[PDB]
Amino acid sequence: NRVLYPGTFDPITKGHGDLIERASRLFDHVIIAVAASPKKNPLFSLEQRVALAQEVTKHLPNVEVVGFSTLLAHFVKEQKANVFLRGLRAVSDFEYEFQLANMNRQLAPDVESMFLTPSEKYSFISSTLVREIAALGGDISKFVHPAVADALAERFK
Amino acid sequence: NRVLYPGTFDPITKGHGDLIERASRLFDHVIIAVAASPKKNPLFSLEQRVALAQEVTKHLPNVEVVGFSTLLAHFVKEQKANVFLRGLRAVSDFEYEFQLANMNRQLAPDVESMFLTPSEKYSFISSTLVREIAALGGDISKFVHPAVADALAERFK
Amino acid sequence: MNRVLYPGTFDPITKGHGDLIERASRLFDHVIIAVAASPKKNPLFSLEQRVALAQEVTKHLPNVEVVGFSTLLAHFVKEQKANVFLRGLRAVSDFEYEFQLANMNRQLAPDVESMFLTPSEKYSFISSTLVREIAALGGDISKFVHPAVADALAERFK
Numbered sequence: 412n413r414v415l416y417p418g419t420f421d422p423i424t425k426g427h428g429d430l431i432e433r434a435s436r437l438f439d440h441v442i443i444a445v446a447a448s449p450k451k452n453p454l455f456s457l458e459q460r461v462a463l464a465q466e467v468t469k470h471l472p473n474v475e476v477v478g479f480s481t482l483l484a485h486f487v488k489e490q491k492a493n494v495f496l497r498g499l500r501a502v503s504d505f506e507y508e509f510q511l512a513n514m515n516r517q518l519a520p521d522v523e524s525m526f527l528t529p530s531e532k533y534s535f536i537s538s539t540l541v542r543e544i545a546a547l548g549g550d551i552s553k554f555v556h557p558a559v560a561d562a563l564a565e566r567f568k
Numbered sequence: 569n570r571v572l573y574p575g576t577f578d579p580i581t582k583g584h585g586d587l588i589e590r591a592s593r594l595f596d597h598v599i600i601a602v603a604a605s606p607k608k609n610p611l612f613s614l615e616q617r618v619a620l621a622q623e624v625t626k627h628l629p630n631v632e633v634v635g636f637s638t639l640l641a642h643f644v645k646e647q648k649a650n651v652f653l654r655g656l657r658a659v660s661d662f663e664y665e666f667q668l669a670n671m672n673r674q675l676a677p678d679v680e681s682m683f684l685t686p687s688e689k690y691s692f693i694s695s696t697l698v699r700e701i702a703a704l705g706g707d708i709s710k711f712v713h714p715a716v717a718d719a720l721a722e723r724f725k
Numbered sequence: 726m727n728r729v730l731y732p733g734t735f736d737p738i739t740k741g742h743g744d745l746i747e748r749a750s751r752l753f754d755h756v757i758i759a760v761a762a763s764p765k766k767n768p769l770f771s772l773e774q775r776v777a778l779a780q781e782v783t784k785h786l787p788n789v790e791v792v793g794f795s796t797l798l799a800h801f802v803k804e805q806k807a808n809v810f811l812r813g814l815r816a817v818s819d820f821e822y823e824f825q826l827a828n829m830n831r832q833l834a835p836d837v838e839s840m841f842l843t844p845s846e847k848y849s850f851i852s853s854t855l856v857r858e859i860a861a862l863g864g865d866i867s868k869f870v871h872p873a874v875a876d877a878l879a880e881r882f883k
């Protein structure tokens with residue numbers, strides 16, 4: 412089993428990292444697929460986001476980070492993954508993932524879509540929230556890895 | 569009864585199409601009112617979206633297609649329609665249509681708001697999803713009419 | 726003893742906002758309307774204008790003040806020494822976003838409470854986004870907004 416965890420990860424947070432720790436324990440191979448997502452004007456470049464996700468995850472031997480800008484249903488076949496991993500924090504996540512799962516079932520029928528929910532300690536962590544707090548000088552050290560905090564710190568001065 | 573089905577239809581999809589076939593069977597006159605929707609930066613122009621919706625409903629005699637860029641509560645009067653038709657796919661749709669209907673009740677008190685839910689076969693189909701998949705060269709033929717599929721294909725080349 | 730801070734974008738302030746302000750003024754000693762600059766929303770009215778509009782609609786309430794701000798809300802509520810946030814819940818969407826924002830503020834401002842009101846069903850559907858879109862198309866929005874705000878929309882789209 413090779414699982415693919417796709418997202419924008421702008422930047423990667425302790426919310427993502429918890430899911431990755433749990434996936435790392437359940438599957439033989441975990442690939443973090445950082446989506447380019449140019450139409451979201453991500454705060455960080457694809458290169459940095461890949462780099463932060465690597466730094467935050469280097470300590471896990473069966474976890475890899477890779478960037479992509481193609482259709483997710485195509486990229487998963489290029490990585491030879493048979494499982495999608497997504498996280499569910501709230502009903503808006505569930506609805507969207509529910510629809511995307513039915514959709515990817517059409518585009519990539521041999522790929523399962525599976526979901527995890529967060530630990531209550533990380534259920535509320537948003538990348539949009541971390542970005543908006545850091546841009547106004549709020550402390551985001553409780554929601555991200557130190558390297559990411561350091562990155563946010565540098566990015567806004 | 570003259571029912572008015574307003575939407576952005578960017579582009580019209582098999583989910584829209586299912587609701588229209590079912591409405592045409594239920595009401596004497598069905599108008600598809602295509603909204604300009606400038607705040608949505610539509611992939612297609614209002615003219616193309618009208619042409620597409622008309623092409624897809626060509627075979628239904630009690631169905632007409634019209635473009636409009638005015639307030640919906642004014643346009644429905646200009647069309648002398650007494651019923652709104654809207655679709656409900658998910659809690660997100662339900663919330664929004666619920667708010668829009670109490671709002672249209674103030675602006676157009678003589679117009680009913682009514683809802684259909686999609687066949688499970690088209691429940692997951694989103695216009696936004698169709699657009700984002702076509703933009704990355706994923707096959708979207710199962711979610712749209714052949715003319716619409718061609719129109720997406722041409723739109724990114 | 727209780728100083729409550731109601732933060733929002735207020736673009737523009739609405740009768741839905743107004744009901745909550747009315748109900749809160751009856752409930753707390755001091756009510757502060759904190760209007761966020763919200764540049765990331767490309768607001769229709771300027772901060773200066775939104776503040777002024779929010780003031781005109783609230784002048785009849787003595788324990789209510791209006792102030793604009795563009796700093797972090799969790800810093801700003803401390804700066805106002807307010808001990809409770811007021812937010813409104815109209816629908817599941819508000820509830821999710823507010824639930825997530827309250828847990829986040831609990832981390833940034835642990836001694837500030839987050840509390841919620843739900844709208845009277847007569848203002849349940851009123852949105853600033855809705856009022857703006859209707860006015861921009863010349864609809865009558867007088868039932869959703871105070872006369873000063875209605876006038877402000879009409880002129881802004883002319």
Ligand SMILES: Nc1ncnc2c1ncn2[C@@H]1O[C@H](COP(=O)(O)OP(=O)(O)NP(=O)(O)O)[C@@H](O)[C@H]1O
Pocket residue numbers: 417418419420421425426427430497498499500504528529533534535536537538539540
């Ligand atoms: N704190 C979290 N806990 C559990 N799952 C999460 C969490 N944050 C993000 N995710 C999930 O993991 C995936 C990747 O997240 P990501 O794409 O970076 O965020 P996003 O959906 O674009 N929105 P945002 O986090 O608000 O910027 C999403 O499917 C999310 O459902």
Ligand SMILES: Nc1ncnc2c1ncn2[C@@H]1O[C@H](COP(=O)(O)OP(=O)(O)NP(=O)(O)O)[C@@H](O)[C@H]1O
Pocket residue numbers: 574575576577578582583584587653654655656657661665685686690691692693694695696697
């Ligand atoms: N597959 C579908 N089945 C039933 N109703 C739908 C479907 N797709 C869209 N609608 C409904 O038909 C109406 C017009 O939709 P429309 O404005 O074109 O899409 P939208 O509002 O942009 N949503 P989205 O599909 O996320 O792009 C709305 O009432 C919708 O909820």
Ligand SMILES: Nc1ncnc2c1ncn2[C@@H]1O[C@H](COP(=O)(O)OP(=O)(O)NP(=O)(O)O)[C@@H](O)[C@H]1O
Pocket residue numbers: 732733734735736739740741742745812813814815819843844848849850851852853854855
């Ligand atoms: N009619 C209303 N009734 C009760 N609370 C409301 C109402 N409208 C807005 N609010 C709440 O008051 C707060 C401030 O709102 P604000 O951000 O300025 O508008 P908004 O939430 O962006 N509305 P909209 O832009 O139309 O989606 C939020 O917690 C809102 O959910």
